[PDB]
Amino acid sequence: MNDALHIGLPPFLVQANNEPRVLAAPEARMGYVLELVRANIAADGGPFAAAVFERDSGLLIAAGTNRVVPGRCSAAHAEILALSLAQAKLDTHDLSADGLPACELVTSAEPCVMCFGAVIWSGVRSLVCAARSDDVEAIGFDEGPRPENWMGGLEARGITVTTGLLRDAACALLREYNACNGVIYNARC
Amino acid sequence: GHMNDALHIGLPPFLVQANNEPRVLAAPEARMGYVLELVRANIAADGGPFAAAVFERDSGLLIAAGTNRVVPGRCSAAHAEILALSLAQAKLDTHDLSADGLPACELVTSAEPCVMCFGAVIWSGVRSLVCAARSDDVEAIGFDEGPRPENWMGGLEARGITVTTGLLRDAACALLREYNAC
Numbered sequence A: 001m002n003d004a005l006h007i008g009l010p011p012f013l014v015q016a017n018n019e020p021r022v023l024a025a026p027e028a029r030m031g032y033v034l035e036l037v038r039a040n041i042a043a044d045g046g047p048f049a050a051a052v053f054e055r056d057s058g059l060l061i062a063a064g065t066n067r068v069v070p071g072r073c074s075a076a077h078a079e080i081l082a083l084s085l086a087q088a089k090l091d092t093h094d095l096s097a098d099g100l101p102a103c104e105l106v107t108s109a110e111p112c113v114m115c116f117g118a119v120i121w122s123g124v125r126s127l128v129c130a131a132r133s134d135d136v137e138a139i140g141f142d143e144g145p146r147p148e149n150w151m152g153g154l155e156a157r158g159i160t161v162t163t164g165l166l167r168d169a170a171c172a173l174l175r176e177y178n179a180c181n182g183v184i185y186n187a188r189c
Numbered sequence B: 001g002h003m004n005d006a007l008h009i010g011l012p013p014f015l016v017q018a019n020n021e022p023r024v025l026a027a028p029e030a031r032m033g034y035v036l037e038l039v040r041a042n043i044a045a046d047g048g049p050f051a052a053a054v055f056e057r058d059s060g061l062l063i064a065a066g067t068n069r070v071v072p073g074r075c076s077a078a079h080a081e082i083l084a085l086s087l088a089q090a091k092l093d094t095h096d097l098s099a100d101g102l103p104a105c106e107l108v109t110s111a112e113p114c115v116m117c118f119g120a121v122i123w124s125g126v127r128s129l130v131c132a133a134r135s136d137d138v139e140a141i142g143f144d145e146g147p148r149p150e151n152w153m154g155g156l157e158a159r160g161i162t163v164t165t166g167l168l169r170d171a172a173c174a175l176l177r178e179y180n181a182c
Ligand SMILES: Nc1ccnc(=O)[nH]1
Pocket: B048, B050, B068, B078, B079, B080, B111, B112, B113, B114, B138, B143, B144, B145
């Protein structure tokens, strides 16, 4: 509405937040996240996606993707959407809240500065990344002024960090995205 | 706010009204003054002691305002800045406030941004950031600003965003203290 923050979720993302799913393996988890990436790109969104799991069971709780441009909202990153939807579903601003399960945020690329903090407040206890910062930098997409050893900063707060998971297919997904960005029409896109 | 087809965070009456009531505050202190009033209402509306609003830098026209809604809105990302920036990018229909053909936009804020919002402002397109309360003032009432890069103000300056702080600061603290007192 015009009297409430309202970020719309594309059909495939709604489905992604609708169908129950459980993926044990980190590979499996990131694999599904990378599926939403390809989708997102085909739904007019940035090449970024994320999902919050119950970490210790693999129960998908919520997913998000970059809807910045189509959404006319710079704050609509993949991490912000998944972290919110996740908090809304479990109905609490704290995923670290008393009773809730230990949550985990699987993202296609190392988080930017905005989301970096977004992660700290969320209440998740673990972050799992795919594409290293350089890969993202490598094609525009600025990570933003993150403080020294942000990764360390997270470990310190109890948020375990991991990067590189399925980085190969992640960087590929970034590239065909970039490959298909210009304005001159290409039927192969 | 748990929906399906979209992420939805409702705004309380006063805030709803704030984004639809025509307003033009030319002076800087006027903008900040208004923002502080919002803080009060927000506290009164089970919200955190934080408010903010985007104004067209030169004209002083209120474009959108946002408060802290984390708790009542079960969303840890709902800070005064995030909302005010997002409703502004909504009204103007663009994810870029520094976009072509749009009068420069400023974000007057009750306190200095948290590392999150910090990045948030950067991606918004706002061309200036005026703050009231300082960071120690914030950590003083028990709120985290998170780990920010050495000299964040520089980062903003360097990225085309003018930083200016300490405005009505003292008035912004009586509000913080009051909140902490209760
Ligand atoms: N500066 C801030 C600290 C904590 N929460 C907020 O909403 N804002």
